[PDB]
Write an enzyme that holds these catalytic residues in place. Structure first.
Site, mmCIF file in Angstrom:
data_model
loop_
_atom_site.group_PDB
_atom_site.id
_atom_site.type_symbol
_atom_site.label_atom_id
_atom_site.label_comp_id
_atom_site.label_asym_id
_atom_site.label_seq_id
_atom_site.Cartn_x
_atom_site.Cartn_y
_atom_site.Cartn_z
ATOM 1 N N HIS B 119 0.812 -1.215 0.000
ATOM 2 C CA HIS B 119 0.000 0.000 0.000
ATOM 3 C C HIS B 119 0.855 1.279 0.000
ATOM 4 O O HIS B 119 0.604 2.208 -0.783
ATOM 5 C CB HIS B 119 -0.925 -0.005 1.211
ATOM 6 C CG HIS B 119 -1.744 1.237 1.355
ATOM 7 N ND1 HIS B 119 -3.050 1.317 0.923
ATOM 8 C CD2 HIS B 119 -1.448 2.447 1.888
ATOM 9 C CE1 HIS B 119 -3.523 2.523 1.185
ATOM 10 N NE2 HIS B 119 -2.572 3.226 1.771
ATOM 11 N N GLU B 120 1.858 1.331 0.875
ATOM 12 C CA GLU B 120 2.703 2.529 0.982
ATOM 13 C C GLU B 120 3.536 2.752 -0.271
ATOM 14 O O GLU B 120 3.719 3.895 -0.703
ATOM 15 C CB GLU B 120 3.602 2.488 2.220
ATOM 16 C CG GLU B 120 2.840 2.547 3.551
ATOM 17 C CD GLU B 120 1.970 3.782 3.666
ATOM 18 O OE1 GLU B 120 2.401 4.848 3.177
ATOM 19 O OE2 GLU B 120 0.849 3.689 4.228
ATOM 20 N N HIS B 123 1.846 4.703 -2.902
ATOM 21 C CA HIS B 123 2.032 6.142 -2.725
ATOM 22 C C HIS B 123 3.392 6.592 -3.273
ATOM 23 O O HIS B 123 3.482 7.608 -3.954
ATOM 24 C CB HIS B 123 1.937 6.538 -1.248
ATOM 25 C CG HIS B 123 0.557 6.458 -0.679
ATOM 26 N ND1 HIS B 123 -0.563 6.873 -1.373
ATOM 27 C CD2 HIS B 123 0.114 6.039 0.530
ATOM 28 C CE1 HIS B 123 -1.632 6.704 -0.619
ATOM 29 N NE2 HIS B 123 -1.249 6.198 0.542
ATOM 30 N N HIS B 129 -5.104 7.632 -2.486
ATOM 31 C CA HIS B 129 -6.065 6.666 -1.972
ATOM 32 C C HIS B 129 -7.209 6.425 -2.945
ATOM 33 O O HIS B 129 -7.663 7.341 -3.620
ATOM 34 C CB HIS B 129 -6.612 7.113 -0.620
ATOM 35 C CG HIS B 129 -5.645 6.925 0.501
ATOM 36 N ND1 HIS B 129 -5.554 7.798 1.562
ATOM 37 C CD2 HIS B 129 -4.711 5.971 0.714
ATOM 38 C CE1 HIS B 129 -4.609 7.384 2.388
ATOM 39 N NE2 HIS B 129 -4.080 6.279 1.894
#
Ligand SMILES: CCOC(=O)c1cc2cc(-c3cncn3C)ccc2[nH]1
Ligand SMILES: CCOC(=O)c1cc2cc(-c3cncn3C)ccc2[nH]1
Ligand SMILES: [Ca+2]
Ligand SMILES: [Ca+2]
Ligand SMILES: [Ca+2]
Ligand SMILES: [Ca+2]
Ligand SMILES: [Ca+2]
Ligand SMILES: [Ca+2]
Ligand SMILES: [Zn+2]
Ligand SMILES: [Zn+2]
Ligand SMILES: [Zn+2]
Ligand SMILES: [Zn+2]
Lengths: 166, 166
Positions: B119-120, B123, B129
């Site tokens: 997930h990170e 980014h 998101h």
């Protein structure tokens, strides 16, 4: 899915600010008026709205401090650096700091708080410095009795649009 | 005028990362395997390649920290913020920080590092998101208990809109 925006800007038009503390140099009333007018410089030419909060976490936290004051950009006592503001973003993003070793005024003496704030809030909204010598965002302080120069108008509208054009 | 330009995507397909330090919760080997697997999630569906460096500066610097850890985006002890990452760009751009006041795990006893890293790293690569509740980029941690991870279509279309398919 969502990709990150092309430029650093707020993703909402309703922004809040909070005056965390006050300079010794001016009354609370003078400081409040200066900041309110500085925000109006920008709301007048975009769809942005600015509402003041008296406590809690605002989008634009405004404070007066000296030397080291909680970031990577320590002030330097009288003269030199006057103020700085962070681009739109999480946490400290948008925050505006004024060096309280300077002399802040409602007049033409020392630094006019309204004018410097108007410039700093440009940064808080996503504008960097301009090379247009007449621009509000030109990195050198000038004093006058206000109309927002066209370079700053074009800049801010490139980010947020014009809002109501009449 | 000048705005603060955002690096939507990395300008190069070959990226380096460095694991600067390690959590007490997992062995070095477990940590290295989780991060390698988290990158593979994204490199499997794009032309991106990731290579590990052991010293010096890398595009994606990975570290574990607590509270204030050097970027003025402080973590908050157990619970709350788990990790954050900077969007593509120079300096801190791409970097990923994990809150070492959380319990990190290669299984389900705590936060699974692989999943949060995946997930990170989204980014780090330029994804914001998602609003799709099933997406990896949806801002709520979830653990399925399945031995295999399948990148949801929303995240695939998201990352490929930036970098294209493998
Ligand atoms: C750190 C230095 O930056 C500033 O604070 C700053 C204030 C300021 C004010 C004017 C101006 C005065 N009257 C009309 N304009 C457009 C122009 C440029 C400016 N820069
Ligand atoms: C608060 C930050 O958000 C996260 O850390 C986060 C981790 C994560 C994991 C999954 C998932 C687990 N198994 C399959 N998927 C797709 C889905 C969404 C997720 N968000
Ligand atoms: Ca100073
Ligand atoms: Ca802020
Ligand atoms: Ca003062
Ligand atoms: Ca935490
Ligand atoms: Ca970096
Ligand atoms: Ca830990
Ligand atoms: Zn500051
Ligand atoms: Zn400036
Ligand atoms: Zn951090
Ligand atoms: Zn996230």
């Amino acid at each position: 899915y969502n990709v990150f925006p092309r430029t650093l800007k707020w993703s909402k038009m309703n922004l809040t600010y909070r005056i965390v503390n006050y300079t010794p140099d001016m009354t609370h009333s003078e400081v409040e008026k200066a900041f309110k007018k500085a925000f109006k410089v920008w709301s007048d030419v975009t769809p942005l709205n600015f509402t003041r909060l008296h406590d809690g976490i605002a989008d634009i936290m405004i404070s007066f401090g000296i030397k080291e004051h909680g970031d990577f950009y320590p002030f330097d006592g009288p003269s030199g650096l006057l103020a700085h503001a962070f681009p739109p973003g999480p946490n400290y993003g948008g925050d505006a700091h004024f060096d309280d070793d300077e002399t802040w005024t409602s007049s033409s003496k020392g630094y006019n708080l309204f004018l410097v704030a108007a410039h700093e809030f440009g940064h808080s909204l996503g504008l960097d410095h301009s090379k247009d010598p007449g621009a509000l965002m030109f990195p050198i302080y000038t004093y006058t009795g206000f109309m927002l120069p066209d370079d700053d108008v074009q800049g801010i509208q490139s980010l947020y649009g014009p809002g109501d054009e009449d």
